[PDB]
């Protein structure tokens, strides 16, 4: 477990998105997982689609909400364990509408075997990303809504709503952090990413962290 980590330094993740006005925050984490798990593999640095996941995967609900955990078992059981290109699938559902479901016309970017729920407990998720890279977290994003810059030292934690990538963290600042991608654009907080406090169960951070396993 190293003092401080940042996956960004390493070239493991790709540029902020935006959701729109669709509730595909889990979409958007799982994805953004999948993204760096493969570039860690070995292969490129690939934009993967979250729209595949939003139209097809059955056992979430598309803009209505979904679950991270449950996107890694579509992919890997109703899909052959393949992600599709944004290219080749780009998102469309940003006005709240999610189209309907293609199976064809796509091409798959990444693969993954399945996925590993990490333990509830931030020093046990720090040392487990620190070595294999960004981890698919849900937060309470209520107080989100403000947020401009800065570790934010004091965070609503009561109800899990929001799915988020877990990127780096800093233990040697003056208040150690947490390092997180967001998918609310560029023009949210810090260039579409957000530092809260570590150590404390910052908008509960800790509950429902996993990870994508490409094997």
């Known amino acids: 477990a190293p003092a401080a980590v940042d996956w960004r330094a390493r070239g493991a993740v790709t540029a902020v ?13 799982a994805i953004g997982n999948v993204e760096c798990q493969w570039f860690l593999a070995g292969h490129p640095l690939t934009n993967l689609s979250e729209q595949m996941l939003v139209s097809c995967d059955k056992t979430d609900s598309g803009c209505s909400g979904g679950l991270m955990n449950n996107a890694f078992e579509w992919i ?8 599709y290109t944004e290219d080749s699938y780009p998102y469309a559902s940003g ?23 990490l333990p ?35 965070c609503v934690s009561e109800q899990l709503d929001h799915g988020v990538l877990l990127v780096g ?10 390092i ?12 579409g990413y957000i530092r809260i406090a570590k150590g404390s169960n910052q908008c509960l951070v800790k509950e429902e962290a996993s990870s994508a396993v490409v094997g």
Do not use: R
């Not at 998105?17 to 984490?29: E, M, N, R, V, Y």
């Not at 997180?180 to 260039?191: D, H, L, R």
């Open 17 to 29: 998105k935006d959701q729109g006005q669709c509730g595909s925050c889990w979409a958007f984490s």
């Open 76 to 83: 890997v059981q109703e899909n052959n364990g393949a992600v």
């Open 95 to 117: 006005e709240g509408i999610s189209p309907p479901c293609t199976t064809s016309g796509h091409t798959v970017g990444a693969t993954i075997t399945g996925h590993v729920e």
């Open 120 to 154: 509830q407990d931030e020093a046990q998720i720090a040392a487990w990303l620190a070595v294999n890279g960004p981890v698919a977290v849900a937060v309470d994003a209520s107080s989100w809504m403000t947020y401009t810059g800065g570790v934010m030292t004091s």
């Open 169 to 178: 963290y800093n233990d040697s600042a003056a208040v150690p952090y947490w």
């Open 180 to 191: 997180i991608k967001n998918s609310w654009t560029t023009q949210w907080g810090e260039e």
